[PDB]
Amino acid sequence: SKGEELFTGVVPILVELDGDVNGHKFSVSGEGEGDATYGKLTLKFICTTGKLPVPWPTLVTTLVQCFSRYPDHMKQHDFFKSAMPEGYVQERTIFFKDDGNYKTRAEVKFEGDTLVNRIELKGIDFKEDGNILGHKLEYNYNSHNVYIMADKQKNGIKVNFKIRHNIEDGSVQLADHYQQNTPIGDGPVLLPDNHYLSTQSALSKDPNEKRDHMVLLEFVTAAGI
C-alpha cells in the first residue's frame, strides 16, 4: 500500500496535546513506539503543565489507530495506513453521560520516521464535582470494540464506540465517542467495508517518575470480516 510498508516494523511515536477542560488548561507529551505487526503500542505520557485536571483514563482514546493490526485478509479495509505518510485528521466528540463533553481535533502523520499525533482538546459543561473534574475514575481500562464505516462523501470514515470508565464506587462512567477521520493528502485512500477494531489496554505507573504521568501498553486488532 501507500503506507502499509511504513508500519512493517517498529515505529517511534510522539504525541502532543493541548487541552482546556472548563477553563483548566494543560499540556500532555507522550513518547513510545508502535509495532503494527502485533497491533502493539507502548507509550509514556507526561502532564508537562503540572497536575492533570482530568483523569488520565479519559484521555486514552484521544492520546494512532494506524498501529492496529489488520489481518492479511482485511488489508484493503485499513484506511489509517493508506493515508500515510501524509496522514489524517481525526475529530471526535466524546459525550460523558450526565456530564460534559470533549471535542478533539488532531492530525497524525509522519515527521521523518516518527509517527506524530498532534491534538487540540476542548472540554465544556463538566460538573465541578463530577466523576471527571472530581477525579472519581479508577486508574484502569476496559477492552472495547470500535465500529468503523466508510464515509465516501468525505472520502474517509465515521467511527463509533462506547468507552466505559470504572468509577471508584464500583459504578460506571459512559463515554460516547463519535469520530471522523479524513486524509490530509489527496492521494487515494482505502474506504473500508464495515468492520471493527478490538482493543485492550493496561495502564501502569513508572516507579521513578515524579511528574503526573501514564504508562500505556495496548493491543488492537481488526476484525468482523
Curated annotation (Swiss-Prot):
Effect of residue 163 to V: In P9; increases fluorescence at 475 nm excitation. In R10-3; matures to the red-emitting state with excitation and emission maxima at 555 and 585 nm, respectively
Tissue expression notes: Photocytes.
Post-translational changes noted in the entry: Contains a chromophore consisting of modified amino acid residues. Maturation of the chromophore requires nothing other than molecular oxygen.
Known outcome of mutating residue 146 to I: In Azurite; shifts the excitation and emission spectra to shorter wavelengths and increases quantum yields compared to BFP
Effect after changing residue 101 to T: In EBFP1.2; shifts the excitation and emission spectra to shorter wavelengths and increases quantum yields compared to BFP
Record note on what altering residue 65 to M does: In Citrinine; leads to excitation and emission peaks of 516 and 529 nm, respectively
Biotechnology comment: Green fluorescent protein has been engineered to produce a vast number of variously colored mutants, fusion proteins, and biosensors. Further generation of mutants led to more stable proteins (at 37 degrees Celsius for example) with brighter fluorescence and longer fluorescence lifetimes.
This protein's UniProt keywords: Chromophore, Luminescence, Photoprotein
Keyword Kinase: no
Lineage: superkingdom: Eukaryota
GO terms, biological process: bioluminescence; generation of precursor metabolites and energy
Effect of residue 144 to D: In Cerulean; leads to improved quantum yield, a higher extinction coefficient and is 2.5-fold brighter than ECFP
Effect of residue 141 to A: In Cerulean; leads to improved quantum yield, a higher extinction coefficient and is 2.5-fold brighter than ECFP
Annotated phenotype, changing residue 189 to A: In mut1.5; shifts fluorescence lifetime from 3.03 to 2.72 ns
InterPro entries: GFP (IPR009017), GFP-related (IPR011584), Green_fluorescent_prot (IPR000786)
Outcome of mutating residue 76 to R: In Azurite; shifts the excitation and emission spectra to shorter wavelengths and increases quantum yields compared to BFP
Effect caused by changing residue 141 to H: In mut1.3; shifts fluorescence lifetime from 3.03 to 2.78 ns. In mut1.5; shifts fluorescence lifetime from 3.03 to 2.72 ns. In mut1.27; shifts fluorescence lifetime from 3.03 to 2.85 ns
Family membership: Belongs to the GFP family.
Description of how the protein assembles with itself and partners: Monomer.
Protein name, entry field: Green fluorescent protein
Lineage: Eukaryota, Metazoa, Cnidaria, Hydrozoa, Hydroidolina
